[PDB]
């Protein structure tokens, strides 16, 4: 009888894969084995999407065409000057140096993993995947390069990303993933990065630059809708898939969710404070979009898995009590720090201050309107803050230790520990547990503060770290808002 | 304007406006500093262009001269598709395939078919390389070229679709040809063989100059004339894109070589190693196919056809 | 454990041996946020409690209001998490202050700005 | 799933758009197709015509109390029709170089060229009439809705005529001795001169309507079944079955072409049995000329049944809009 | 023996062609002899462009395919919100309503002449031309369609250039080319319009759109670059043509030159009070486009004519000298009847006074200046100016008679005849020759002013011919920029 | 003259037959551009040139600072051209004001705003 759409795709796929006569298949496929994760039959896998490459490249050259004719028209219409305010381009040096190289590195992990799976059907799903992130890495650079000719910052984005200390936070999230087997890799980056606690990152990034004038970014955004439908369906697909093969398999799962949960929020914190602080057109605060897409959505999700016998992640509590004070913290370990920043930060309006009272009724005017009223009367003086003391960095998750107890919002949340010898730290109790089930690799961190008492990072002294090592200009790419070249420049485009 | 391109471009080719393709392709990759080893390699770091023994000062000498940047290639293929897409609804509406006697389908299942396992073989392979290579400039040429081979599967697998009416039955056969058919034993086992190799411009080497390099113009030039004497001319337009695709392959694969082979006497005496152990079984992997088609003749044309194209390069093979 | 295809055993990059003769040392002093993380400090072990105190510790913390009122040292002391009662004239190693040792300072009566801990 | 802070605007769409079809967002093919020409107040009576102003509904004897009643089913605005066609003509320039690059043409025997020569390439003068009447069509017909579909088709016919003039190229190897040839048949071939003679008849027809009838229905829809569908089938026969992939083109322009052309017709005969009456009238004195047009052809090649057939074929087509013809 | 490009062109165009046999070719071909134009060979006819239609489709494709990505980009974004001020947009109302119009009239003018002419390659020509001209019309009617949803004065363009009167200016002028024969048509818009005049039109809205952030106006203008560069070697190919096939069309071709400079120079006039005093940012003076595109520009072309016997038109000294003065007494003209406009006029600023002094050192601050002094005082009075009488109409350019004596510039140029029993009214002497030597045609005018005194504006107070009449809102679309529901929905943005 | 394929023959569409018993008359008023052309009046034939005056032209030109001082009735005129002395208490028609004639009247002595004519 004709085939089904379902048993067609299967033959223009997995049909062509065969059981190998002269090689080992372990030798074919060397890596699936390692993790504990037991594979039952590859041929329960369901295709996430069935997409033939006629149609893929069909599909996809009918949406770069209209992108790139919308980028030269934004830099022909030099575009850049209808954004609300140039404080908005500092989203954007913080995209290109810290998210875009994790698209690259996307790209590299899934082409990998595309080749290490036995299942045909898998390995399509991951290779499709791989060429989307290589897409959404050129299309970025490509996006971001006008805004490159007119503001400081975006110049050197994958050279600071191996260096600078704030860019290990993302660098060793996806560093981490990728030294991890194959089915630990899908497990971080498929299910938890793109299924779970995808629209953390892309909804305030996006959906900013719609509030901002930003036509580039916005374009971009719509252009990557289809393509992350794709990628939170092979996400779920995943999950469903391992869980059902073994019951074995169900307990490592629920590791990987509670390591991939908490680390993925520690990376998260970066965008919290984006959004919050550095939009100048407000979308909703960080405290809305995690009550929505984590407390809300996640915890439908988490009632969906609980059928194979997964709980909700470790720690998700001291994350949802977290939400009233992340990007307030952050913020405020940027404005000290950002002498050795490539984005510049300043004290907010009094207007977006009572949009904080109001979004954050329990801790701002309690702990962090204070802290601007302080930082502003000594900016005001000519002693405006920068903190020249290097701080305390995380064993695992490598942000300053500047995170506060669930109970206790003035206590740091430190901890430490002594393993074979040595004494190594963290921020809470979420990195901690991580560290203790794996401490080989985590003893193994490149982190920056150590790197520089080390002397590796070509300078002792710290303005020949920022300019010599990171490429961070001083006095352009650096320092307070107020002053800068690009507040100069825009004040001059207006 | 302050600047006109980024700074890694500009270190390469100077503060001037920058084209797509060189914003897209250079040094955008990850390449020091990493956090922890990989658990699945005991000798080798994240991103190390040890990887191979292949040893360059700047893979980035490696460069694409048809500059496909995503945009460019999807765009490049979303043109030829369409013209394949045609002529396969013109085939199937007139019943081109159906027609054909059942001597010349079976013809059609057995030697041309069966090669889309040979296509998947390359898609591995070229997954493979691209998340082993370091540099932006050979990684992407190595997805995109993994991608056309899955393409490419997938049109020879409609061929057998069109065939059988859409039934399924004619891949059933194709496939146990090249499971259990001795003509296809010698290059099964060669696609099994380099779906172990370590050493990702081995790979490169054997799948994307050596295998190719005779097998395209076997079958898709050579055994194409054959088949219009075996009354199957209207096969031609379905593969008609075969044809184009490899003509477009040789720019970057030629690229590639003469920057490698270029760089040293140490690269061009490994590549040398590599071309004598597996230049003769790729021969070896044709020969019974050839002498079931369109004759030995056809597969010595292609080999001496290969023999010219590695002098470009100042290496050689028999 | 680390599951691998080998002993996935290596050195730890931030043993003392790597830091040319100095230790790393961490002060944390609590309701200072102010400085939003403990001080990462390099640090000669051979230097006096009372040299860290002035050299180190005083010109850190110089920008918060409370500095100059703080007498750090007849402050409450913990080394990694214990009681801890330095003594001024000895040297950071022979009384116990090792690499990547963490030392809290808490200075009674001085406890931040605004009820905030700052 | 991106928020968006849109806008409220003061009104949806053009006045002119509004009265026609509501206050609310228009198509693409609305805003671009719609009382957007000019309708009164003329300034000059033309030089050219002693009986109609400029933008006369009058030139054709039909009358419509609304001539954007025709409307486009394929909804074909200037953006719509161009993007459609370059993907059309991407595959068919690919099948000309496919037969130019392996000598599918060149290589038939020179009596199978001659017969190509003969029966198939002079259709580009034909094409060109249709081009031309067309033309007319568009300048003469006051909805832009009905002058767009006319103006699109005339291109179109022009496009055919190249692909036809370019298979005779291909036989003479791009010389042009195929195509003086070819017009030497088309100008003094006793089978093309019943042809010859009702094109250069249709180019003098005032009415336009008369003639989107006549060019656009009567002729193309006997012409274009018996010659790329019935002679296309006998090609195979005469050993030129390859042929068939260069006049791909023309059956997939065909098939979209029925769309437009029937919804045309049902809207102007459904108007009035008046309009009807007429229509019967300049089919009863035209198909029989297209029939007897044709008769040659067929008969030199696929025989006079294939032509009957498709009388019969226009036959049925016309008795939906309640109009007759003397095929089965 | 291989075909040459040119040749293998020809053959596909047109070879297709056939000399008729079974009817006449002056039945077939009946406008080409009324004119008096002789054609000796129409194998002379060079093809101005060489495009096979699926060539045509293929890159037509491609531009649309990009216009519309960015349409579309600029709507979701709301683009209009970017513009340097909403001051602006009426550069866009009279763009819609005057212009627009006048592409559609050239799609349905040129379908006529691809079909009257016997030769196949300048049928072809005009072919491609009135495609070209169709798309023009469709893409601007969706490059306007985002600023109708939040501006006034753009929603019924087609039905007030039938009716509003100054819009009787840019639909007569197309009227008279439409009802001439088809050389005239083609000497009119080909070589008149499309080649020599093409930048005075083109240049200012296209510029000026990129200087005030436009970019729908801006990205249609980039898309329409490479049609007008056919269209300009259509425009070139055909007066060589004409005036190389007999020497008795030189004469005719001289009259055509001169009668369709003059028209096309009282249609331009618009365009000058646009770019002059619409535009918040300046690109340049009508003075210096019209020194550069016309001076400069058109007098090099006429040097190469003179091998031909044609000399540069009548009367281009008086149109050289008005550039001084035009732009100020249109917008004057405007001012005082803008209750009767689907667009607004106001006092230009301070800043742009200084401008136009620099500009126009010779005529600003002499004539025209003490005139906004003037009226800025009665509108801070609360008597803001409004001429509550009607004009005299030009008999050919229909526009009022405001313009003045070459070195008289406070003296009009008003001129007038009798024609068989009738009196009647001229600008200038430009428009009185053209008047003279075909009366029969300019006698049938709709002269707006006149009809409305007939009754034949469907009202006799003129609220009612404004209001239901041309369809303009009456406090929406008309009267003062300040004030205007447009200012205020801007200063709200 | 015009060259047609016809007898190319039209009626004026402005011929007097088509205003109802009135008449168009047009009055131009010397350096006073405050007005940018002649005014185009809708008239009847026998109303009296005193009437003309005080009823039409009068008011017309009420908007301009030297109205209010012009003596138009005694002014300089002109009828098509024409040295023209009117008549106040004729009727147009009677003293030779056609249809679409013109009058110039030139107020000596009151010749605009700023040296401008305006
Ligand atoms: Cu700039
Ligand atoms: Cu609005
Ligand atoms: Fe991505
Ligand atoms: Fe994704
Ligand atoms: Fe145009
Ligand atoms: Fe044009
Ligand atoms: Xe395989
Ligand atoms: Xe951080
Ligand atoms: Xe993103
Ligand atoms: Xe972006
Ligand atoms: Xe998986
Ligand atoms: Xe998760
Ligand atoms: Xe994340
Ligand atoms: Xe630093
Ligand atoms: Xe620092
Ligand atoms: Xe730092
Ligand atoms: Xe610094
Ligand atoms: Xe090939
Ligand atoms: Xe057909
Ligand atoms: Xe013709
Ligand atoms: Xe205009
Ligand atoms: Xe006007
Ligand atoms: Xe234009
Ligand atoms: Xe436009
Ligand atoms: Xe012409
Ligand atoms: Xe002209
Ligand atoms: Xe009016
Ligand atoms: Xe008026
Ligand atoms: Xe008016
Ligand atoms: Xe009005
Ligand atoms: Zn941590
Ligand atoms: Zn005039």
């Known amino acids: 009888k004709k085939l089904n759409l379902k048993d067609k795709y299967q033959y223009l796929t997995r049909d062509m894969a065969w059981e190998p006569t002269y090689q080992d298949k372990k030798d074919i496929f060397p890596e699936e084995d390692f993790e504990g994760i037991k594979i039952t039959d590859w041929s329960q896998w369901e295709d996430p999407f069935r997409l033939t490459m006629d149609a893929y490249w069909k599909y996809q050259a009918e949406k770069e065409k209209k992108l790139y004719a919308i980028f030269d028209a934004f830099a022909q219409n030099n575009g850049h000057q209808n954004i609300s305010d140039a404080r908005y381009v500092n989203a954007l040096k913080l995209f290109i140096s810290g998210i875009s190289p994790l698209e690259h590195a996307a790209f590299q992990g899934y082409s990998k993993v595309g080749r290490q799976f036995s299942g045909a059907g898998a390995r399509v799903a991951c290779q499709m995947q791989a060429i989307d992130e290589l897409r959404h890495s050129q299309t970025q650079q490509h996006a971001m390069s006008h805004y490159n000719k007119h503001f400081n910052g975006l110049h050197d984005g994958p050279h600071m990303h191996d260096r600078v200390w704030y860019l290990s936070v993302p660098k060793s999230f996806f560093d981490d993933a990728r030294s991890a087997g194959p089915f630990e890799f899908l497990t971080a980056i498929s299910f938890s990065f793109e299924y779970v606690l995808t629209n953390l990152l892309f909804v305030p990034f996006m959906s900013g630059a719609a509030y901002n004038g930003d036509m580039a970014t916005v374009t971009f955004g719509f252009s990557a809708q289809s393509d992350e439908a794709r990628h939170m369906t092979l996400g779920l697909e995943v999950i469903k898939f391992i869980l059902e093969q073994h019951e074995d398999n169900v307990p490592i799962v629920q590791r990987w969710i509670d390591k991939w949960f908490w680390r993925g929020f520690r990376l998260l914190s970066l965008v919290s404070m984006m959004m919050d602080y550095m939009l100048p057109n407000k979308v909703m605060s960080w405290s809305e979009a995690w009550e929505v897409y984590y407390e809300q959505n996640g915890g439908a999700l988490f009632k969906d898995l609980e059928r194979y016998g997964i709980r909700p992640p470790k720690y998700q509590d001291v994350a949802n009590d977290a939400k009233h004070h992340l990007s307030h913290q952050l913020w405020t370990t940027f404005y000290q720090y950002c002498q050795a920043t490539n984005f510049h930060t300043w004290i907010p309006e009094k207007e977006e201050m009572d949009w904080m009272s109001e979004k954050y009724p329990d801790t701002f005017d309690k702990y962090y309107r204070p802290r601007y009223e302080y930082l502003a009367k000594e900016a005001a003086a000519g002693r405006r803050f920068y903190n020249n003391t290097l701080p305390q960095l995380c064993q695992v998750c490598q942000i300053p230790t500047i995170f506060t107890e669930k109970d206790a919002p003035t206590m740091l949340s430190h901890r430490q520990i002594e393993h074979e010898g040595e004494r190594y730290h963290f921020c809470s109790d979420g990195c901690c547990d991580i560290f203790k089930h794996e401490p080989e690799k985590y003893i193994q961190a490149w982190l920056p503060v150590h790197q520089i008492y080390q002397g590796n990072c070509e300078g002792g002294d710290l303005e020949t770290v920022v300019q010599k090592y990171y490429h961070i200009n001083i006095g352009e790419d650096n320092f307070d808002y107020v002053g800068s070249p690009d507040q100069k420049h825009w004040l001059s485009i207006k | ?318 | 454990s680390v599951n691998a295809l080998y002993d996935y055993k290596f050195e730890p990059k931030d043993k003392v041996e790597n830091f040319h003769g100095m230790q790393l040392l961490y002060v944390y002093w609590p309701d200072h946020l102010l400085f939003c993380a403990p001080f990462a400090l390099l640090v000669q072990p051979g230097m006096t409690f009372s040299a860290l105190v002035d050299e180190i510790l005083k010109p850190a913390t110089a920008a918060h209001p409370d500095s100059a009122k703080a007498d750090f040292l007849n402050a409450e002391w913990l080394l990694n998490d214990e009681p801890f009662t330095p003594k001024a004239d000895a040297s950071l190693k022979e009384q116990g202050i090792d690499h990547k040792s963490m030392l809290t300072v808490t200075t009674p009566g001085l406890k931040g700005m605004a009820n905030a801990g700052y």
């Not at chain 2, 691209?130 to 056309?148: K, N, P």
Request: hydrophobic letters at 40%.
């Open chain 2, 1 to 318: 304007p302050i600047r006109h391109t980024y700074g890694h471009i500009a270190r390469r080719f100077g503060d001037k406006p920058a084209t797509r393709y060189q914003e897209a392709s250079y040094d955008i990759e990850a390449k020091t500093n990493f956090h922890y080893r990989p658990q699945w390699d005991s000798e080798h770091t994240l991103n190390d262009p040890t990887r191979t023994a292949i040893r360059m000062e700047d893979w980035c000498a490696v460069s694409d001269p048809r500059q496909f940047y995503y945009g460019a290639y999807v765009g490049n293929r979303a043109k030829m598709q369409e013209s394949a897409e045609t002529s396969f609804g013109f085939c199937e509406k007139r019943n081109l395939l159906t027609r054909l006697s059942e001597e010349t389908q079976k013809q059609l299942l057995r030697l041309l078919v069966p090669l889309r396992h040979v296509e998947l073989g390359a898609n591995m392979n070229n997954a493979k390389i691209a998340g082993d290579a370091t540099a932006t400039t050979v990684s992407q040429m190595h997805i995109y070229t993994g991608m056309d081979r899955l393409g490419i599967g997938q049109y020879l697998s409609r061929i057998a679709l069109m065939i059988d009416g859409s039934t399924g039955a004619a891949l059933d056969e194709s496939k146990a040809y090249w499971m259990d058919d001795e003509m296809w034993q010698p290059m099964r086992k060669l696609v099994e063989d380099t779906l172990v190799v370590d050493d990702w411009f081995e790979l490169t080497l054997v799948q994307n100059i050596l295998i190719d390099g005779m097998m395209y113009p076997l079958v898709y030039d050579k055994m194409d004339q054959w088949f219009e004497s075996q009354g199957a001319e209207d096969v031609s337009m379905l593969t008609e894109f075969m044809r184009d695709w490899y003509k477009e392959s040789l720019r970057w694969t030629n690229a590639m070589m003469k920057a490698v082979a270029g760089e040293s006497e140490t690269n061009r005496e490994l590549l040398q190693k590599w071309i004598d152990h597996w230049e003769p079984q790729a021969y070896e992997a044709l020969k019974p196919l050839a002498e079931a088609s369109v004759g030995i003749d056809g597969l010595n044309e292609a080999r001496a056809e290969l023999s010219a194209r590695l002098k470009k390069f100042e290496l050689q093979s028999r």
